[PDB]
Amino acid sequence: MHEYAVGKIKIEHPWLRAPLEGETRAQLYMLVVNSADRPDRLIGVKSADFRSVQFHIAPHLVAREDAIYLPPLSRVTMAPGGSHVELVDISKMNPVGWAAEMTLVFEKAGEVTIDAAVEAPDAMHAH
Ligand SMILES: [Cu+2]
Ligand SMILES: [Zn+2]
DSSP states (O other), X not given: OOXXXXXXXXXXXXXXXXXXXXXXXXXXXXXXXXXXXXXXXXEEEEOSSEEEEEEEEXXXXXOSSSSEEEOTTEEEEEOTTSEEEEEEEEOOOOOTTSEEEEEEEETTTEEEEEEEEEEOTTOOOOO
């Protein structure tokens, strides 16, 4: 239910599937609304909790480019079965039910700090 905004970009309920026990990878999901008349891209995700990210097409295939394409005047859902950001080399993760602080970097809009809800490894979310 929580949302964020930067430039003409709006991010709705970012959330992630917590890694399995002993694993260092997670999946970041969100709904992104681009109100600009120009395309934009999610080109980066940064945090102290992990050291890098990858952009995946379902299941876990490295995508077209290392970014999430955001067409003008469009709503893009990153969700299980579609596309997501893979959080790699997680060092520190809050338990399920809490939030993980990270910074999203948009190509045009710039940076925004968010708190993604940490959810169970098999969780779903309808926006
Ligand atoms: Cu929310
Ligand atoms: Zn993946």
